[PDB]
Subunit: 98 residues, 2 copies
Amino acid sequence: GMADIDQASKTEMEAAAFRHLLRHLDEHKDVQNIDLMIQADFCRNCLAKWLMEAATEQGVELDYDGAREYVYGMPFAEWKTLYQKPASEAQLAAFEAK
Amino acid sequence: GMADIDQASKTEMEAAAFRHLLRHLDEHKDVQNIDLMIQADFCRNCLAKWLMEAATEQGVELDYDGAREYVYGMPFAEWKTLYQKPAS
Ligand SMILES: [Ca+2]
Ligand SMILES: [Ca+2]
Ligand SMILES: [Cl-]
Ligand SMILES: [Cl-]
Ligand SMILES: [Cl-]
């Protein structure tokens, strides 16, 4: 199991799995952040925030724009223009519900 | 940005963010795998499969039950009996 694997390999595997998640989300641009928030309490923006937190743990610098640019594969502003639809009344309500 | 960070730190950050997502999902055991499949096209089993694929990349064995035990924080059988509900 995981307990049996050397730390360096485990870190590489967890890193690889994270990058896989980024590709998956990039391949499903129809999957909206507000729906991720409603269903699962996280979205692409949270992954960017979590990277910034990890940057602090590693003594390195990453700001939110840089983190988002990495997560989205381009500047957030461009992603928003090209791909994002604003929330529906039902999504706002359902977000307000949770 | 991310391209400016040394490779070892960047790897550590990606791994940390993956472990954060695991803790997040463990904190939301209410969030069923079906809803994740519906809304996001992946679920906890997917994360475990991706970890299996990453193990192969690293020249180590991690089988599916091993991967799921890690992702879920306990054997999947036990998780299914305690947390999984039939789909409405
Ligand atoms: Ca990407
Ligand atoms: Ca866990
Ligand atoms: Cl979105
Ligand atoms: Cl957003
Ligand atoms: Cl489930």
